[PDB]
Copies of this chain bind each other. A is one copy, B any other.
Amino acid sequence: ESLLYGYFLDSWLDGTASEELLRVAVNAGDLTQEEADKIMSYPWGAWN
């Protein structure tokens, strides 16, 4: 599991990360594509 998985998931659940931002993280190798797809399976902005 990527070290920043939880960090990016939390940003998705709080609505601060967009799909574009997750693509940047995948491109950088900070998330795998599979992890970004998992994160996007959650409701965007669920915490709000």
Contact = CB atoms under 8 A, between A and B. Distances in A.
Contact of A16 (B7, B20, B38, B48): B48
A3 B1 contact: yes
Interface of A: 1, 3-7, 9-11, 13, 16-18, 20-21, 24-25, 27-30, 38-39, 41-43, 46-48
B28 A42 contact: yes
Contacts of A9: 4, 30
Contacts of A41: 24, 27-28
Contacts of A48: 16
A38 B46 contact: no
A16 B46 CA distance: 8
